[PDB]
Amino acid sequence: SEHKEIRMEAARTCSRLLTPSIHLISGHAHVVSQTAVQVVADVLSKLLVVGITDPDPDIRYCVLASLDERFDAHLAQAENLQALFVALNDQVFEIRELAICTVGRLSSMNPAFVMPFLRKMLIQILTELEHSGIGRIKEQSARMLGHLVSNAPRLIRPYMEPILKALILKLKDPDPDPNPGVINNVLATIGELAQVSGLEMRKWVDELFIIIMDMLQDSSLLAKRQVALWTLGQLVASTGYVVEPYRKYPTLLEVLLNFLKTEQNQGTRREAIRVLGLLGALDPYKHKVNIGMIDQSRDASAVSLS
Amino acid sequence: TTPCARLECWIDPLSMGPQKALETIGANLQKQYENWQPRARYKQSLDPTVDEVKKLCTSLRRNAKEERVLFHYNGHGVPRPTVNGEVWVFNKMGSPSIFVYDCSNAGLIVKSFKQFALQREQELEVAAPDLPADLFTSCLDLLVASLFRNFLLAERIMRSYNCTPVSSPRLPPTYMHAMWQAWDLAVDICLSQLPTIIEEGTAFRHSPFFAEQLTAFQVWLTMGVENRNPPEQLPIVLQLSQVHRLRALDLLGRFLDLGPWAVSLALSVGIFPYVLKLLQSSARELRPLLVFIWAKILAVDSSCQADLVKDNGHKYFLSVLADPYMPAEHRTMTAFILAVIVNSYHTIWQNFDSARWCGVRDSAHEKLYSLLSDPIPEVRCAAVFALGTFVGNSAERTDHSTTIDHNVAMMLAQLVSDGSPMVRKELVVALSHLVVQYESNFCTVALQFIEEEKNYALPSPATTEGGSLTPVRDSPCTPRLRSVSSYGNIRAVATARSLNKSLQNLSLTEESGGAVAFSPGNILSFETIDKMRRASSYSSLNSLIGVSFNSVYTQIWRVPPASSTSSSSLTNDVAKQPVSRDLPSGPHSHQFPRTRKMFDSFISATVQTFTPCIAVADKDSICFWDWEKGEKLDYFHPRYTRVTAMEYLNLLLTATDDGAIRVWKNFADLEKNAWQGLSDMLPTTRGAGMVVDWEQETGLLMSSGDVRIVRIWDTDREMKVQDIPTGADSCVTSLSCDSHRSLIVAGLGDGSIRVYDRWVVKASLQKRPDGHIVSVSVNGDVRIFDPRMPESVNVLQ
Amino acid sequence: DAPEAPLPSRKAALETVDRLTESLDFTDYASRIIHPIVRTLDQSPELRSTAMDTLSSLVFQLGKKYQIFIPMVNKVLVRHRINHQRYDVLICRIVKGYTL
């Protein structure tokens, strides 16, 4: 196991210019726990790498991340990476984002360096990481974040008015992605009123993007608990309607759950009456295994058939 | 003063007239100013003259007191009213501060100053003179009143507006107004600092202190709402600038929403995150989450200290920064708020840890005279030692110690009380940390002939001061000549008798520092008493030593274990078996347990290795008679070569008295047992090498000599002189390596020891006055070393 | 990237500067400001002196982003051959503004 890389030291350290990707696609399996791998985790990130050859010599030290001894080198790795996000490299934007996810994350500089990528937004999904990417870190110190956060919705909420869409969906994905941040979302929950309206008034476009409106309504409802008892029956109504236009309903699956995880339960089948039939309807029709699946949970988690 | 200083006021209704409640608003200012204070002259509507009068009244009002002075204005239909003169003829510790409220003229007014100053600066010179400094003019729809006027009052009041205004209040909702008083006690305390962050953020270095000035300067920054109008009203100041920005600014934003909940009803809260959430990761960077930052924080910590807070965790986090010092310690004093607040609490116990930890390290910053803080520590710092705990107070007690030894503000009587408690625990700690500390607590006495009460421990510590450790440390030698400062007055008289007693008690620490230190004025372990034995070798496990004796009876001593004589006159050799206690001698052999001879120019040096007895035989063919066989496999070929010593892992060494030191390639003698043959024959040292060091785990050479110098040698590819020791005035018997470390450990016919560093520099030197060191011993990892001298051997650690 | 009309490419990049001078500029937008830095390398050297000024106008207000963003732009104008001036002057200035 050991000698596999032991000579490859000189090799991986030395050139072979186009290949050392595969040098460093290795190790990466495995170990060789001696302190050279420290410096090996270093100098090949000190060259560093150039011209789209970059992504893994990023991923690597992310996979090569370790601790605790020399704390410089640890976030010194990060230091580098942090800088490296910007430089074109459109997945290598993502990819180093996609990494880390644990650990160390902190240095007050960093959030100020973390944030701007949330402030990219381009490309959209790049941001969508750091939200969750801070989703934890949010709750280390909201000090920087919670407000840096609070900006974002305060930045984001206004985006509900401005025409359509391509952003109004680029509202959607960033809506929950902070929800790994809990408390802030709690202490506001006017995202209800905004979005509660967002679905109602129609018909604006194809609006195909709507479906992801709902996902957030859902994941929110988790942190939303009996607080969320507000506005419901409408939702139960509206969605209960929304169940029967404009299909695929992957959400109403996940959607209706969490409502009942916020617990209007058995009387619901009065308010909305036919939901039984309405489900009893769907069940044979759709395949969409989840839809096959979730109606159960829908049913199941709802009720108790009376 | 209380309230601070003199202030000016004006209002523009129009021109020369009163008004309903226009009277009333003026006081509200003075009130608000008293809420910020001071001697305030209200006016209304005046034609310029009536104004001009009271300026001179305040120009009379004696501000050499005031810490500042103010000139307010407000909006009249553009009253031009002495663009220059009254202003400029009243012009540049009661420091003047000017205030402007304009559509335009504000800057112009400011612009005017400099311009008029440009005159009233330059044109004064040829008159050989108004000096602009400490004279500043601060600059200024549906819901306003007068913004920049309200701004400073009203600091938060205005803030609540830019809250309600607008888009954010969707989230926090909702508005109403007012009420909410004692929960608001924090918002100020917050918004107090919330700006100051940006301040320490942007300050550089123009800054506070002086209060009401900064109080404005703070409230100035509330102008960043400025948002109203595409002329976002852009106050101008030249005593900056960001506004905007300043994350705390973006931060206070939801620090409001923390309050917008509880205000809805019922209060209830209470609490709120801000100070807390700011407090927490202040440790983060404080630990290692910052690269220099610049502390990013400390400003916050200051006001944070003032409350019961959280006060500890702050004061805790304080010492954290005090740990990250020295580098940021200045920045602490930049903020200095310790000097403010740390001194501001002389009121600690649990805190005494931090009060030490913060304050000690603070007090450590070296320094500022405590002044009355010295009586406070004479209370507080003294009462800390009451528990005799902890070592957390070990040197922490000694914080205040050198202060009395620093300068005299007594430091004598208030110290006398401590003078009792100080020396008391001094011997009770018996730890050089608080002791070498308490050495300063001792030093705290200054001159101050005190009492036998003082003279009581004078001997008592001096005893432990004899004890110390490595008492021959030249550190004592200087520390000896230290108190000899008091002794320049000798030989007389009274305690001078008592002085000489404590004086003579310390023996002498002599070189190497003393070798330098002497002219400026101009552990020693075991010592056996018997006739001088030539070479001495301990049994490994047992402290029983062989000592080959000049009295021919080679003695065993477990530090008498036994003598032995199979030999005559000088017995110059003992080498114990590397495993057994079996020792050779010269060339009789013994085993200290059997304590008798095994088997017998004479061979004065032999050492067990392989299993060589490594010895250079004077038959001139060096004979190592291998103790198993007692047979010499190498006898090879014009003197008695000075050395046969196995180079540890690999080899041997031979110096020759002709001057040629010959490194051994002994391989074919070791491979048989090139029997004896020279690797490097290098006459440099004119004669017999007094010591050769074949490095323990490496191959360096050495040549010691009685040449009154030494040469370190590097023998790898070939022997070459590494560096040279020197400074010997007498015959240097030998040296050695430190086992793992590099210490040339040398000794001389003076009885003194030279510990020399790999510069070939003797760093430490043990000296004995009466001896001549021809012999030494060493214990490598754990260390107890047996030296020798003319009376008899002296072991030392 | 505009359609290929070169006028906006400058003129847009100007109205920026206009506000890049004025209030509320950087942090909320950073990459989106640095992204077009590349668009200067690609399209007409027209865009240089505008890029000179766009980027410059930034350098004034916020220096955080400035330093970052040191190296990126260092390589930027290499391909675009500029390596000058006032922007660099600012760079010198504000690096010195860090020494100051």
Author numbering:
A (entry chain A): 613 to 918
B (entry chain b): 78 to 169, 186 to 221, 256 to 267, 340 to 438, 441 to 548, 584 to 758, 778 to 814, 878 to 904, ...
C (entry chain a): 1123 to 1222
Copied sentences from the primary study:
The complex adopts a 2-fold symmetry with the central core primarily formed by two mTOR molecules. mLST8 is located on the distal convex along the short axis and protrudes out of the rhomboid architecture. Each Raptor binds to two mTOR molecules and extends towards the distal convex along the long axis of the rhomboid with the WD40 repeats domain located on the apical side. The C-terminal region of mTOR protein forms a compact core domain (designated Core), in which a “C”-shaped α-solenoid (FAT) wraps around the kinase domain from which the FRB domain protrudes out. The dimerization of mTOR protein in the complex is mediated by the inter-molecular interaction between the N-HEAT region from one mTOR and the M-HEAT region from the other one. Structural comparison of mTORC1 with FRB-FKBP12 shows that upon binding to FRB, FKBP12 would be in close proximity to kinase domain of mTOR and therefore lead to steric hindrance for substrate entry into the catalytic cavity of mTORC1.
mTORC1 is one of the most important regulators to control cell growth and proliferation. Deregulation of mTORC1 has been found in many human diseases, especially in cancers and mTORC1 inhibitors have been clinically used for the treatment of organ transplantation and solid tumors. mTORC1 regulates cell growth primarily by phosphorylating a large number of proteins, including the eukaryotic initiation factor 4E (eIF4E) binding protein 1 (4EBP1) and p70-S6 Kinase 1 (S6K1). Here we report the cryo-EM structure of mTORC1 at 4.4 Å resolution.
